[PDB]
Amino acid sequence: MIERFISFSVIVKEWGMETFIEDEDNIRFTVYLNFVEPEELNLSKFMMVL
Amino acid sequence: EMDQRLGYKFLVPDPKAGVFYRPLHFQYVSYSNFILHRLHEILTVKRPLLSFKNNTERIMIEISNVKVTPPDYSPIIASIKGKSYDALATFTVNIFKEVMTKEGISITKISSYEGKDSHLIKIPLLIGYGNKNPLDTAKYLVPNVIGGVFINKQSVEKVGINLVEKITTWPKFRVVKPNSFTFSFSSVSPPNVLPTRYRHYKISLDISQLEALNISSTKTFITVNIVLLSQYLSRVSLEFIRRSLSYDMPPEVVYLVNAIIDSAKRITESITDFNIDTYINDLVEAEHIKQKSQLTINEFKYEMLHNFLPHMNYTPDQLKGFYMISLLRKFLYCIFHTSRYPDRDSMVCHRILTYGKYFETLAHDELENYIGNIRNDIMNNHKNRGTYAVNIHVLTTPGLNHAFSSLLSGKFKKSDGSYRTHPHYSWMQNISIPRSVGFYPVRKYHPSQYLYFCSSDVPERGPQVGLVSQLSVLSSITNILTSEYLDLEKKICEYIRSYYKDDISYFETGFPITIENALVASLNPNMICDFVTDFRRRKRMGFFGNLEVGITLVRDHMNEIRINIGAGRLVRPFLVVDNGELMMDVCPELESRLDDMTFSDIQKEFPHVIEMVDIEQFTFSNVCESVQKFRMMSKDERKQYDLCDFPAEFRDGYVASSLVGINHNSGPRAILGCAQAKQAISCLSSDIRNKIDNGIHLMYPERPIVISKALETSKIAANCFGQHVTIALMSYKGINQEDGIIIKKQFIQRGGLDIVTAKKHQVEIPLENFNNKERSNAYSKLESNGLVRLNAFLESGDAMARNISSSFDVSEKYTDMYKSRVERVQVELTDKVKVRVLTMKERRPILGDKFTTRTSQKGTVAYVADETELPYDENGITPDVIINSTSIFSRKTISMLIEVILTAAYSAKPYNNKGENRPVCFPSSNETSIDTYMQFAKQCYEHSNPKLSDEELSDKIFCEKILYDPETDKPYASKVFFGPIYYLRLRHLTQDKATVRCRGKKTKLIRQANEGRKRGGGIKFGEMERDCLIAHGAANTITEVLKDSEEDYQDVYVCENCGDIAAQIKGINTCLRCSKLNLSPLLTKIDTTHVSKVFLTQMNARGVKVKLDFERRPPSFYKPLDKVDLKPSF
Amino acid sequence: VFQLVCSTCGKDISHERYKLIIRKKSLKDVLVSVKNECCRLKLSTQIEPQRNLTVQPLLDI
């Protein structure tokens, strides 16, 4: 779900993903991002719609 | 039980505060405020009308010398004679030009008018308590009169309800579409600004377009980004706005905040060398050019930006900017948590109009129209002629008279229920109607109506379902004058600015303080609680000169402090809880002194026991439901509560207070009981023989003795609505079924539940016809003077006054199937003759008449049994009424049983230990235990007969008896429930509903029976009945039912070529259209209804030609047929 | 204060009514000689309604 949303997004420029097992009962998905211009406006929109 | 005594103390009269009758007090003042004070302020104006040159040549209109006077006759004289009850108001008008000169002021009169001796304005006058008006300070009060009515031009009594204002006090939220929201609000000038100014703003937000977060109106303000507008008004940075908005919000809203702020910054940077003032000025100039305004740019800009927020006029711009910021904050919060923001149907954001406000608004509107018309006339006269002449006949017709007449007729803006003719069903209606509140078309029971409106008193059917509510006995509506408003506001501002000098300038992380939505300060959060507490204490001591000020602390995340002082707010008294402590319990002297003190004395001498709280403040507080539940909590639990409520019996209306123990029954029964309690017949009027009006009156009234306190203080009990009768709960020969009742003949003969119906008749006669000299059979009851005789009985064909048109009688006729006695006759002679007659008739119960109890057990008379045909007890008592017992337990009306028991107890010992008559308190919303009632009844019986066996005492307490069969004198199988109860008679009578027709008139267009019971019309055979008859298979029956009467047949011919009804010329059938074309078509006879011909002709009018053929089947012959058996082979 | 008999059983209650309304004796002393429930309720709860004088003449032109 996460990867599909990020891949086709029109407000993301560069992206990467990874997954970690925090412990026996948690999973951590990490995403590295760089947005298109304007930067902070798109950052706020992304964090709002994620 | 001290709380019950304190509640009682509020319902009794309070002479020290000028309260002589609590139930309607707030209405009287609402009118005394208008007729005495507000009218003078509205009328007394001194305004420019036109200006010339440059503010040195202007015409001025001034109004002064306003006087108001009352009539010279009592309202009873007005009712009898047929006059009207109005007060007369007169004023003087000056129109004069003024020229500004360095020497001072130049005045040149142009016109002046006066109304010293004229009906310049006629204002309807309120009758009020004791038949006493605010203008007349007489010293005689008519007892048993509470007033609350008006008398219109035609001598008709009128009564009205309260209405909810269209302008709310909280902004309205709405989801325009997915991810697209709007937020609309309004601004209005303070009371002391004539004329009042209005503004209506809307904020639009859309997730897809965050650069268009725009505030707008209609042709009165620019469309600008709200963040930049706040920057302009308050002169602060964008980062400041970000920090202010995202201070104490949940993290989900902060993302939206950041997006909005960054969008605003992007707009800012898209313009080279951005400057806020230039931005605003460019927008203003673009708007100016878009419109065709002829003002200079400076005038346009000043007008736009100076009247930005009328309610906050004469304050710096920074406070306006902060007000905008707080509105935006609430907008965002409601976007993300919609269910926690006051809904639009909530009573938290509404206010209510009383009697005075209707008249105030109408006066405002008419004065404005008057001045506008004068200005237009002067402009036209200057345009055509010269010298600026003011035409007469335009400054002598203010137009108030027509407005007030239309108001009393039932027209007020877009509402049509404000006023109506008073239907004289009950004495309690005088209370019920003035205390109603209507809402514009919402039908669900909102939680905010609880405790301030009666829960059970609402319409049960019709178009008004769920749109009319009734105040509780303890609720009221605030009034306030203009001078008092100003003084109170000034005191509040002085207190805020004096006691909190260092901590009212936060503006970034504080709580904005508003007075009537006017931001005046911003408080340090760490001090909010104290500020409220210290405030409320000062409120209760009268420190501000007013005990009804409302203070609300909103804290979810909106973080606001709201103070309300205006008029039109709902307020109730509450018990105070101060620092986890009930003040009522720490005031020992109050219990000893309560007897000799009034409500205001308690407020003055024992503050902090009771606080007057309005609805908005209530909705945000923590309130304990009862004193008993409070006393059962730990101190830590107690520390969380601000108020404590009164017993439940104070949460009902005055109508619902007629019933008993409504909380022991089902709710639908309560609704029905409230609906019918108003239709019971009572002692309607003290002027039974004087007033010429319709009505119904109870003949031998009795005062109920199982009542609540509200029924005693309102005087509903002292005016009676029934009688005490003996009832038995049993089946009688299977006759009393499906709510029918058996009634006793000797009870009816002796006067049981006997009523009198009175009716009013009125006619107008041209003088010649009245004086015309010819004895028709309709003039048997007429005296030599052409008027009906006193005390005579009129029949269904009699006339009341001679009216001959010239040698024909054209007088109106009496049209009731029963007779009536002529009680009073009044005549007025003018160009015409006006005759009014009052007739009366006594109506003992008969089959079909309708009765009920106070628990909604309604039934009609099904049989009139003789005294010797009824079961009797060992004392020889037979019941006056017999009701089937099964319905009592299938409908679950338990309280009824209890009522009977208590009534029986009252009969055994009806006096105190001092020997005084002692009613029994059984309130609606009881709260007392059944066991205690049984113990009271047991004590009563034991006092009565000290020597009773246990079985006898139990039978008496439970109201059980062995009854005997009159025919055989033998007991029945088991004991019966048998005892006295207060019984009511409703106004639905059989002879008022009977109808029959044999032959009569017809409607001209279609030639069918006419309509109207009073006009001898027929009953309508609907098409559902037609479907039913077709379901039986009876074709001939319905065919003959839908056809014209066989006695109205006639020969009609139709042309087979074009379908026209052939005319008959010189006895020859001929189709004119076809004859003109040299044709010889066949004419055939038809048998149809008249309406069919009308319909077809009208269809021919529109251009459609309808042609009919006829069947010419060849002849047929009968032939013998062989036999057939059809039985089986067995 | 108007009817002369009990509407339920038909007994005579005029003497007690005079004793109560005109001599203004205690309700207890009055009821000392009344036994039936209906009669006690009638003597305890019946009133004469409040009314104004009648405007005269009844026929006015």
Ligand SMILES: [Zn+2]
């Ligand atoms: Zn024809």
Ligand SMILES: [Zn+2]
């Ligand atoms: Zn009796």
